[PDB]
Structure formats: C-alpha cells, structure tokens
Design a protein around this ligand. Structure first.
Ligand SMILES: Oc1ccc(CNc2nc(Cl)nc3scc(-c4ccccc4)c23)cc1
Lengths: 7, 220
C-alpha cells in the first residue's frame, strides 16, 4: 500500500 | 556490519529527519495528526538510511515501520522537548503544556523527557536508541531475523563505545545501557496508548486522518 510506495 | 562505531554514529547523525512546523479539541488533534503524517514521510527516508535496514526485504521493512512508527515519533517528540521542562515541543510553533492537553499520554511523554534530562541523554545515544526501536519493535512478530539481531548487536556496541569514550567505567557503562533500554519499555507502552487513542479518533470520523495514517492504524 502507501508505505510500500513510500519505501 | 562493517562500519566502525564512529562511522555508525556519523551515519545515524547525518540521517536525522528535519524538524517541521505545524484551540478546540477537534483543532488541536488536527494539528497533531497532520504533523504526525508529515513526520512519517520523513521517517521513511530516515529508516532507509539506518544501516542494515536497506538489506531487508520490502515486506520486512514495511512490517518494522508499521510496528515502530509511533514509538519513533514519540521518542523524537520527547527528545526535542527535553530542554523544555514541563512542556512538549510538538513543533517550534506548537509548544504545549499539560493543561492544554490526551493528558494520560502527555504525562507519560513528559516523564520520559524528565528521565532523559536526568540521565543527560546525548544526541549520539538518542539516534542509536531510535534505530534500536526500528529494528527491535517488530522483530518478534530466519536468516533475516539473524541479520536484524546482528545489526542490533552492532548498535549496542556503538552505544557502549559512546559511553566508554565519555569516560564511564565498565560498571557504569552496563548500568547506563540498561537504563536506556528500559526506557524503551515505557515508549512501547505510550505508543500502545497512542495507537488506541488514534483508533478512537478514526471511529468518530471527525479529525481528518490521512490515508497514510489510516493504513498505519489498519496494520495495528
Ligand atoms: O508529529 C508528532 C505528533 C504527535 C506525537 C505524539 N502523539 C500524541 N501525543 C499526545 Cl500528548 N497525545 C496524543 S493522543 C494521540 C496522539 C497521537 C497518536 C498517533 C498519531 C498522532 C497523535 C497523541 C508525536 C509526533
């Protein structure tokens, strides 16, 4: 999710 | 696992995130959650610069940040509040006392600030403690776990290196290491209380919670 995209 | 203790300390110092800027009860927690969302984005960048973290799989990185994010926000808030006794420096323009508070968490945060101030916590020690929170808080939830423990042992060596350089005896080193790590139990406790407060805010659908924070709650 968003955290995946942010890392 | 190749860095010297001094290189470890300088790597963590250089990775430090910036300090960001930010009354009804709907409005105060709007400020806090908006600030937390922005600090979380900078957290991701810092996490990627903690040595050992980039070695992990994306899913292990996600798990560790999902577990530790509020503990990391909280120790960061305590650290920048340390020189403001009795108050929490949420932002340079948001310095709050306990009457303005939430109060149960506010008091726990102030007590940690007071403990850090009484131990004279050093910035080099703080960035080590923050990195330990990131690597430890989700490790109990096989070669990957061994890597994380090897890195954790390195950070312990680094903390001990700092107290040796500071002139502490062996006995004093071990005692201070223990004092520092026991505070992490209290930070875990505050994060669990803060998470449960943030779930209550989500349920009543009044405070504007970002997509990002909402998924951090889903993970808990
Ligand atoms: O940028 C930062 C913003 C806030 C904090 C510490 N956050 C709190 N501090 C106090 Cl004193 N009370 C409460 S109640 C709920 C929270 C809370 C839980 C999850 C996200 C946001 C708020 C909270 C640390 C850094």
């Amino acid at each position: 999710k968003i955290l995946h995209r942010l890392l | 696992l190749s860095l010297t203790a001094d290189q470890m300390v300088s790597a963590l110092l250089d990775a430090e995130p910036p300090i960001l800027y930010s009354f009804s009860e709907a409005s105060m927690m709007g400020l806090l959650t908006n600030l937390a969302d922005r600090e979380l984005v900078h957290m991701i960048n810092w996490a990627k610069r903690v040595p050992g973290f980039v070695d992990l799989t994306l899913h292990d990185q996600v798990h560790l940040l999902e577990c530790a994010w509020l503990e990391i926000l909280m120790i960061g808030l305590v650290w920048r509040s340390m020189e403001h006794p009795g108050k929490l420096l949420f932002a340079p323009n948001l310095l709050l006392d306990r009457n303005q508070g939430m109060v149960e968490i506010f008091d726990m945060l102030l007590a940690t600030s007071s403990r850090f101030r009484m131990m004279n916590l050093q910035g080099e020690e703080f960035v080590c403690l923050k990195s330990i929170i990131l690597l430890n808080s989700g490790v109990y939830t096989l070669e990957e776990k061994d890597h994380i423990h090897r890195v954790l042992d390195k950070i312990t060596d680094t903390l001990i290196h700092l107290m040796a350089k500071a002139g502490l005896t062996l006995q004093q080193q071990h005692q201070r290491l223990a004092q520092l790590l026991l505070i992490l139990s209290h930070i875990r406790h505050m994060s669990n209380k803060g998470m449960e407060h943030l779930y209550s805010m989500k349920c009543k659908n009044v405070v504007p919670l970002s997509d990002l924070l909402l998924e951090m709650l889903d993970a808990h």
